[PDB]
């Protein structure tokens, strides 16, 4: 059915205790405990009678005026006619404040509303009745309110507060007798710092749980119109903090809705950070960070290096995101999920620069004819992929990996893969690059289509023709063309269509 705070849901008996003394409480006295409603405890009854009733009074009912008349009369008796103009809600708040302050712990039937043991039991059961969200809210309340007081108050002050809570006459007398205990109490002038500390904590919490929904709505509606960088710039927040808030909001929504969180979101918001920082760590081994990816010459050493770097930075994104131009190769949601989920590491380590794809298309070759006929067609099938890569004098140069793996190269390195069914196919980009020395860097800024052209950049035909390529001078080009073009004309020995009448 419906379970809430008013009607406590039935919980399991084997639940662990929340407070420390109940963990050491003996089992017999644990079994002695009854199963009672929350208000059956004297502290719960006191709360329901004093504070919860006044909280309910603000709701629309019939006895509201009847009780408000009495409370207003009491307030007028307290403060002459000044409090007549005070609002009814203000009067209720004042009464609640006074009843909270005048609360005392002592003998149950001697005037005190409830005992310290009853208060401890109520606190323990109230903590037990909380779920994960309840405990999270409890910790939030602790951080908002109690933590500044603890940070600003001395252990002597805490012990004095404990003595006040227990309200033991002899123990209070013993604590007050000590001269050092009298002199070690804190000063209100120093305790005033707790106000500013609490304000700062509440300011951070307000940032989180009030600017999270707004930033989340803006970034979910129009991520390209409101990127995290723009949101941080316009709201004065930290650029990293905005993304952290978005991630936290989405993950908390998933967790409190009992849905598996979108694990791709931290990758999509910290793509650069994910590649840079997230690593697998061994036990007992201390690790370091590479300040620079390689040993290179700085761009300040030469005037041309400086110009090259500034031009590349101009052509480069400051912060690349999921919707930007380099990620336009993820047409459908299948591509989107595949790229951003469980394979982003390999997908980003495949190629350093960001290109309009992740690899190269795979095309399959044709099998050489086998004159043995069907007596040998089976022999090229096996249980494994047989991968072959060309080596030789002209192949295997690490410094020429890009030019050797360029598909538009007539002397491209030749790779073949025989599948377990005999199919001869080409190799993927990662498969081709696996044969060279590994490159373990990435580029998240430079995007080639944004390069400058026209101003200061104009490739000229004169520079290329300075080599003077002449077909009558060198005929290797004609030889390669002859090699490429078909040769079936040689068996016909002007080409003309057949004549049939």
């Amino acid at each position: 059915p419906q379970w809430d705070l008013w009607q406590s849901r039935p919980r399991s008996e084997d639940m662990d205790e929340a407070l420390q003394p109940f963990m050491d409480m003996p089992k017999s006295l644990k079994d002695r405990r009854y199963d009672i409603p929350w208000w059956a405890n004297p502290f719960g009854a006191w709360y329901l009678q004093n504070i919860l009733s006044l909280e309910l009074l603000k709701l629309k009912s019939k006895t509201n005026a009847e009780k408000i008349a009495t409370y207003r009369s009491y307030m007028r008796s307290l403060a002459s006619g000044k409090d007549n103009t005070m609002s009814d809600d203000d009067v209720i708040r004042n009464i609640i404040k006074e009843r909270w302050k005048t609360l005392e712990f002592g003998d149950r039937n001697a005037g005190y509303p409830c005992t310290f043991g009853d208060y401890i039991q109520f606190l323990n059961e109230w903590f037990k009745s909380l779920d994960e969200e309840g405990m999270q809210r409890l910790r939030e309340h602790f951080d908002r309110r109690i933590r500044p007081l603890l940070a600003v108050m001395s252990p002597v002050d805490i012990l004095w507060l404990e003595a006040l809570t227990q309200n033991s006459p002899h123990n209070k007398e013993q604590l007050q007798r000590k001269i050092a205990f009298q002199t070690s109490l804190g000063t209100p002038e120093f305790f005033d710092m707790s106000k500013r500390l609490r304000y700062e904590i509440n300011e951070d919490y307000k940032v989180r749980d009030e600017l999270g929904p707004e930033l989340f709505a803006l970034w979910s509606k129009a991520p390209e119109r409101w990127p995290p960088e723009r949101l941080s710039k316009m709201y004065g927040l930290d650029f990293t903090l905005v993304r952290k808030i978005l991630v936290w909001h989405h993950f908390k929504a998933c967790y409190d809705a009992c849905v598996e969180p979108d694990w791709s979101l931290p990758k999509r918001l910290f793509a650069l950070e994910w590649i840079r920082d997230v690593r697998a760590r061994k036990h007992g081994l201390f690790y370091g960070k590479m300040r620079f990816a390689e040993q290179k010459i700085t761009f300040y050493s030469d005037r041309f290096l400086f110009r090259d770097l500034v031009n590349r930075r101009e052509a480069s994104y400051a912060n690349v995101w999921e919707m930007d131009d380099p990620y336009r190769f993820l047409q459908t949601e299948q591509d989107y999920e595949d790229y951003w989920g469980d394979n982003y590491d390999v997908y980003r380590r495949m190629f350093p620069e960001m290109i309009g794809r992740t690899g190269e298309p795979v095309q399959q070759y044709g099998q050489m004819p086998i004159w043995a006929g069907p007596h040998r067609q089976h022999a090229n099938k096996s249980e494994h992929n047989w991968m072959f890569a060309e080596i030789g004098v002209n192949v295997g140069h690490e410094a020429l990996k890009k030019l050797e793996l360029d598909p538009t190269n007539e002397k491209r390195r030749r790779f073949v893969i025989r599948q377990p069914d005999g199919t001869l196919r080409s190799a993927k980009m990662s498969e081709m690059r696996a044969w060279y020395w590994k490159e373990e860097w990435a580029d998240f800024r430079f995007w080639a289509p944004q390069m400058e052209w026209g101003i200061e950049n104009t490739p000229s035909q004169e520079q290329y023709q300075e080599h003077v390529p002449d077909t009558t001078d060198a005929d290797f080009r004609k030889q390669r063309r002859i090699q490429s073009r078909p040769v079936k004309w040689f068996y016909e020995s002007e080409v003309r269509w057949p004549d049939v009448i």
Partner: peptide, 28 residues
């Protein structure tokens, strides 16, 4: 190995904070 249950955080609520904070438990 053992997870920190942070049960010592709950012990601070057993101190009658209404005496000094003047009813901080409620909404404010």
């Amino acid at each position: 190995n053992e997870a920190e249950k942070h049960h010592d955080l709950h012990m601070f609520y057993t101190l009658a904070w209404w005496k000094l904070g003047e009813g901080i438990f409620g909404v404010d």
